[PDB]
């Protein structure tokens with residue numbers, strides 16, 4: 313008999329600042345050095361795709377455009393993938409191939425779960441140190457943006473009748489890499505991440521409502537138009553985020569309500 317809320321977050325320029333570092337709009341809006349903005353943006357970009365290629369089978373899975381990690385779970389036999397050799401299995405077919413596809417997404421899921429709170433372990437040294445230094449420069453230049461978004465994400469997580477869902481235009485694998493490198497692994501259960509690169513956010517929202525029911529209250533949080541328009545088409549309240557203040561306002565609302 314408890315009211316339940318489903319928070320449908322956007323990632324880029326909502327929870328994290330990354331793309332706006334390359335375009336110079338963030339540095340320009342808050343008076344930061346544009347040259348530092350771009351340097352940091354490119355370094356993080358390198359780390360995101362390097363983690364993607366090296367550990368999340370990005371060169372293998374990219375051309376699939378999958379929406380959710382479990383979309384091809386039908387073809388998984390559930391075997392142990394601890395010693396399974398992905399390189400020598402000839403993936404690059406339509407049935408024995410579907411099984412190898414599924415194996416890869418589940419191994420991604422396993423990597424994500426064992427390393428979500430130990431990204432330094434996954435990334436390995438010396439990348440870990442460079443990563444911690446990058447995150448440090450990033451937090452400074454963005455005036456603790458991530459610190460603010462996390463405060464809302466963690467209040468949502470700790471609250472019993474609230475849940476965190478993620479919908480991003482970023483492709484699925486790179487999205488998981490971003491989420492991991494920005495320390496969001498522990499706040500977003502992998503089964504709650506959706507990539508709207510191709511089906512679009514409206515479809516993803518519809519799918520998320522099918523999954524959580526009509527009795528739950530949805531709140532679409534984001535900085536972009538797509539997300540807002542999709543929220544209208546489904547009569548889902550929309551919470552826009554344009555600056556730190558907006559993340560603080562969400563946090564405030566989150567702490568005054570007991571469900």
Ligand code: BEF
Pocket residue numbers: 322323324325326479480481482536
């Ligand atoms: F992550 Be959202 F698509 F900017």
Ligand SMILES: [Mg+2]
Pocket residue numbers: 322323324325326534535536
């Ligand atoms: Mg966005």
